[PDB]
Amino acid sequence: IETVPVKLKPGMDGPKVKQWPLTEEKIKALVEICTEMEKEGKISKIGPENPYNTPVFAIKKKDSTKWRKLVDFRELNKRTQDFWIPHPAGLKKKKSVTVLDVGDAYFSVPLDEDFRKYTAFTIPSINNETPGIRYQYNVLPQGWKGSPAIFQSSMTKILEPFKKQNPDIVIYQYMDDLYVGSDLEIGQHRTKIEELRQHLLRWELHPDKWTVQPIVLPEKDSWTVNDIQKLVGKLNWASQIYPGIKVRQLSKLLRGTKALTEVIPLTEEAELELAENREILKEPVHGVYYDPSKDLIAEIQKQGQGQWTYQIYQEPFKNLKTGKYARMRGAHTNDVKQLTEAVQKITTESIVIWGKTPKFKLPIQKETWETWWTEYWQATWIPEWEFVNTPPLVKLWYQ
Amino acid sequence: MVPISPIETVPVKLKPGMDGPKVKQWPLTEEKIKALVEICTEMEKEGKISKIGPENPYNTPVFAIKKKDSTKWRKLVDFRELNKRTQDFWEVQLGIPHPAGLKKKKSVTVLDVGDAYFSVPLDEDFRKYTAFTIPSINNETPGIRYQYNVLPQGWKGSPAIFQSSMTKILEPFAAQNPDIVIYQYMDDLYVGSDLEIGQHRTKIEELRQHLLRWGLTTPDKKHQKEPPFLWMGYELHPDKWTVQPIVLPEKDSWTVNDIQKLVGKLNWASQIYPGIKVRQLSKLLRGTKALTELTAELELAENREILKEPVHGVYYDPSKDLIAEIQKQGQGQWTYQIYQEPFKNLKTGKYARMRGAHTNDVKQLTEAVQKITTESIVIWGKTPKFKLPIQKETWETWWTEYWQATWIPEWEFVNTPPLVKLWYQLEKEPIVGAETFYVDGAANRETKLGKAGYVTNKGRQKVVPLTNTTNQKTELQAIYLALQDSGLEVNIVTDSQYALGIIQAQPDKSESELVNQIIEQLIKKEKVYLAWVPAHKGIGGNEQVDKLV
Ligand SMILES: C=CC(=O)Nc1cccc(CCOc2cc(Cl)ccc2Oc2cc(Cl)cc(C#N)c2)c1
């Protein structure tokens, strides 16, 4: 129960981040939450000699109608001193993985008395009527990068019995979440998860088939001019990813100022060039590797009718992962709820595959996203993001 | 002698690596020196300050400024260097309450605390740095030396530390008396309740006794402030609020500073006054960062007529629904009113289109909605229901086909023209029986001369030569020519990624006249299918040759 020494990175002051407006019911939710946290010693009120601040807001996780408190520790985490476990490659290869919340555990551990002034947050008031309630954490705070790293020793001891019992069950931790995988493919894995639940009390995702989904070309008996023009455009784009793609024989079909709806029969040379390009796109991309020293980039496109495509990469045209998300979730009428859920699924997949989160390029104006994304967010972490304001011509190609 | 409860001092330090303030005292007149000694002696009796020995090395200058009235002199201490050297404090009272947010209270009392900073002690360890010296007469004796024992006026930490202390004392009384509502702002306190004026003035006295326990002075005498209250440039009345009168300068020649002052004064009027617009004056400000330097003027003259009739706002009732209505004013300007009951506006306002090269109405309305949404959550802690001049079918078509993600919170159509509309809509598949125009354009960078034209499937052709142009300008002209010369349905094939990116963003108005002409053509077409091909791949009809020649 001995506080461990923690300091900021050299040359970096604590976070000074503006709190943004909250609705009345989210303020009332946080007032109830933070009052009780004071009685339990988790947090304590502070004064104006603390110039530091980190934003805080409220969410409702699924399967519950109770508000939860989320702190945006992004600025603190980047300014927090780097803490001295290789990512488990088996977790991405495991048939099924289950995610658990271990955040409550962090509250048992005290936080170094010197570092607490950096965990300061503010419950805001409506209309600037009364000054905001200012708190600081006395225990390890959820969402902080130092909380999993400091608790790693205790967690290793807590799960050392379960690990010896089951050596085919993978265990990984990111932020306040625990990722438990298995090749069991058993509904009893759900009960074995209950075994890991009670074992924790004492003290559903499955990988996609393809990491990168293949580029596919249409198979047709009759091609129009427009059909051949869209094909040549896609192949030319893929020629940036794949070496030997050739468009010469297909473009020769387009010769002449022909009407768009007119059917062109393919030559035997043109049929061959398309088959050779098919074979090129069946093989995987050449020399694509993940560097843990670089950032992951995630781009998302809205495809219409609740469908969304995405690609994860570090170097353009060298995709480490591509995929598509559709949903019947309660988001059909709201594009922003769909994107926010899409951003969450992609970041979770990213945690499983490399144990880090990507920087998103979102197909949305900043002011719309910033006004609404907290309304639909359900995860204890938050990634980084930027905004794409120019339509990508490539949207059709990923569909 | 009943015991006063102690006020806990706020622990204060300096910025890291700064020793403290060592700044020499300014020369003073003998009359000013005498005047300062009388004031300081009284304060030393009050306990606000204490004399200090020669051990202290820190010093801050002091000056005397005289109000002619009563031949009176007031002490002014300049802590600017200690302010630079003092630590950073929590952000305090960033922004102010907005009157439309206040709920109505049958009785409301305002109390202004007196010598408030001097009623709150200073941390003993920091008092060493608040030292100042009073120069001696003729400089023939060592100057008198003093330090502060309480929060100095003009110090960096004094406002933050006072407000924190004031809140702590007030917290128990508020919990004990939930019926009253107390607001904190600077050196004032606003107490409001729906109680009978009798029980109200009773609890007001009880609060004053509560402050007495911690030694805080309050206006027991019938408070000089009585409704209407003038607060932060607002005129506040029991059932209505408005802006204090606005003074717009009148000059045959207007310097740049006046336009900077007149644009801000107009923005302030816009919160209650509908129809205020400062777009023309703000354009004149652009490109100018110097204070010394009109088409537009009729709208500015119209603003004076608008400001000549009195406009008031109501207070907020949480039981009724909150509503916001938006109107298109033209030239990228939007006007909105937030209200709960018809014709009774809590507040009003305007929104100006962001600086963009192209745009359309639907995007701008969307941005206006986000702004009103954030403003309302600030003011009332909730999102209003929206009344919007756009058909539901129109918004539905827009968001389902816009390549970006977009959302508007709950809203309803209000038929108040002009109505936001989609001016044109591209086809998703090629049109059967529509002539196909293959277009191209190109320019020589050195000569700035180029060509634009098309060849079609019916043998129709055109190449037009151009004088002052670029590759991007010619690529657009080619499309423009295909639109001018085609029937009501037309397929257009281009290789310009630049043009498609413009059209695929769906502008309805633009900075470039060439883009607007294309828009005017698109509006007249029944169907338009725009297809893209890669250039120089030998796609047929891609007559780079005709336009490059
Ligand atoms: C004779 C009746 C009469 O005078 N009533 C009356 C007058 C004005 C306003 C109201 C309703 C809103 O006023 C308040 C509402 C609440 Cl809940 C709490 C405090 C209020 O008063 C404030 C608030 C602020 Cl921010 C600043 C100031 C100042 N200066 C005064 C009522």
From Swiss-Prot, chain A:
Phenotype for D101S: 5- to 12-fold decrease in affinity for dTTP substrates. Strongly decreased RNA-directed DNA polymerase activity. Slightly decreased DNA-directed DNA polymerase activity. No effect on RNase H activity
Effect of K61A: Strong decrease in RT binding affinity for all dNTP substrates and in catalytic efficiency. 100-fold decreased sensitivity to ddNTP inhibitors
Domain annotation Reverse transcriptase: ranges: 40-205
Outcome reported for the amino acid change (mutating K61R): 10-fold decreased sensitivity to ddATP and ddCTP inhibitors
Outcome of mutating H206A: Complete loss of RNA-dependent DNA polymerase activity. Complete loss of RNA 5'-end and 3'-end cleavages
Result of changing D176A: Strongly decreased RNA-directed and DNA-directed DNA polymerase activities. No effect on RNase H activity
Result when mutating K61E: Strong decrease in RT binding affinity for all dNTP substrates and in catalytic efficiency. 100-fold decreased sensitivity to ddNTP inhibitors
Effect of D177N: Loss of pyrophosphorolysis (reverse of the polymerase reaction). No effect on RNase H activity
Binding residue positions for Mg(2+) 1: D101, D176, D177
Reported impact of W237T: Complete loss of polymerase activity. 87% loss of RNase H activity
Effect in UniProt of substituting Y376L: No effect on RT p66/p51 heterodimerization
Effect of K61Q: Strong decrease in RT binding affinity for all dNTP substrates and in catalytic efficiency. 100-fold decreased sensitivity to ddNTP inhibitors
Effect of P51G: 64% loss of polymerase activity. 57% loss of RNase H activity
Effect of L178A: 76% loss of DNA-directed DNA polymerase activity. 60% loss of RNA-directed DNA polymerase activity
Effect of substituting W373L: No effect on RT p66/p51 heterodimerization
Consequence when changing A270L: 68% loss of polymerase activity. 10% loss of RNase H activity
Motif (Tryptophan repeat motif): 369-385
Consequence when changing W144A: 73% loss of DNA-directed DNA polymerase activity. 70% loss of RNA-directed DNA polymerase activity
Effect of substituting L281S: 31% loss of polymerase activity. No loss of RNase H activity
Domain of life: Viruses
Outcome of swapping L235S: 17% loss of polymerase activity. 30% loss of RNase H activity
Positions marked as site (Essential for RT p66/p51 heterodimerization): W372, W385
Consequence of changing M175I: 54% loss of polymerase activity according to PubMed:9533880; increases polymerase activity according to PubMed:9657675. No loss of RNase H activity
Descriptive protein name: p51 RT
UniProt source species: Human immunodeficiency virus type 1 group M subtype B (isolate BH10)
Gene expressing this chain: gag-pol
From-to range in the entire protein, with total length: 604 to 1027 of 1447
